[PDB]
């Protein structure tokens, strides 16, 4: 009744505590994604530990432009993730092409390939604005399993 309701929040507290990102070296957004590891604006053991390998991680951050050559590649990586998974599409390329969009190769918005939970709009995604991409992620995890 009360113990059951608090135990579900305790499991959700583990995702609120720590989430491991994926080092998607996809574009210029990946350089600012490296700035999350940079000391001045840090999530290093604040709630983020870089390790790579899609099998171990909990959150994958799509960091830039995706093309038709990359659409089969990213899709199965998301499938290689453990079932409690979150996708953060960071940048205008990740939201529907920086420019592009009306281009031949670029797939529009990532959502055509892989579903996204948290959007970051910033081209040069400022590390200040990037910090929401992990903090809002933890805030969005509220309730899991009622019955």
Contact set with other proteins (CB under 8 A):
10-11, 13-15, 17-18, 39-42, 44-47, 49, 51-53, 55-56, 58, 82-84, 92, 95-99, 101-102, 108-109, 111, 117-124, 126-129, 131-133, 135-136, 139-140, 142
- Per partner kind, with CB cut-offs from 5 to 8 A, the member of ligand SF4, other proteins, none near residue 64 is ligand SF4
110 is in an annotated binding site: no
- Per partner kind, with CB cut-offs from 5 to 8 A, the member of ligand SF4, other proteins, none near residue 44 is other proteins
Is residue 34 within the footprint of ligand SF4 (CB under 6 A)?
A: no
Is residue 27 within the footprint of ligand SF4 (CB under 6 A)?
A: yes
User: Closest by alpha carbon to 94, among 32, 140, 144?
Assistant: 32
DSSP 67: B
Is residue 64 within the footprint of ligand SF4 (CB under 6 A)?
A: yes
Which residues contact residue 106 at a Cβ distance below 8 angstroms, ignoring those fewer than 6 apart? 65, 66, 67, 93, 97, 100
Is residue 29 within the footprint of ligand SF4 (CB under 6 A)?
A: yes
* Dist. CA 122–CA 100, nearest whole Å: 16
User: Closest by alpha carbon to 65, among 88, 97, 41?
Assistant: 97
User: Closest by alpha carbon to 84, among 139, 15, 10?
Assistant: 15
Contacts with ligand SF4, residue ranges (CB under 6 A): 27-29, 64-65, 91-93, 98, 123-124
């Amino acid at each position: 009744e009360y113990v059951v309701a608090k135990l579900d929040d305790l499991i959700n507290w583990a995702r609120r505590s720590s989430l491991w990102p994926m080092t998607f070296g996809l574009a210029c957004c990946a350089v600012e994604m490296m700035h999350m590891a940079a000391p001045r604006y840090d999530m290093d053991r604040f709630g983020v530990v870089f390790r790579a390998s899609p099998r171990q991680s909990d959150v994958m951050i799509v960091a830039g432009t995706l093309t038709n050559k990359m659409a089969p590649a990213l899709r199965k990586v998301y499938d290689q993730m453990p079932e409690p998974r979150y996708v953060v599409s960071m940048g205008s390329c990740a939201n529907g092409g920086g420019y592009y969009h009306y281009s031949y190769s670029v797939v529009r918005g990532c959502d055509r390939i892989v579903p996204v939970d948290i959007y970051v709009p910033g081209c040069p995604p400022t590390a200040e604005a990037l910090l929401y991409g992990i903090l809002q992620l933890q805030k969005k995890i509220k309730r899991e399993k009622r019955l």
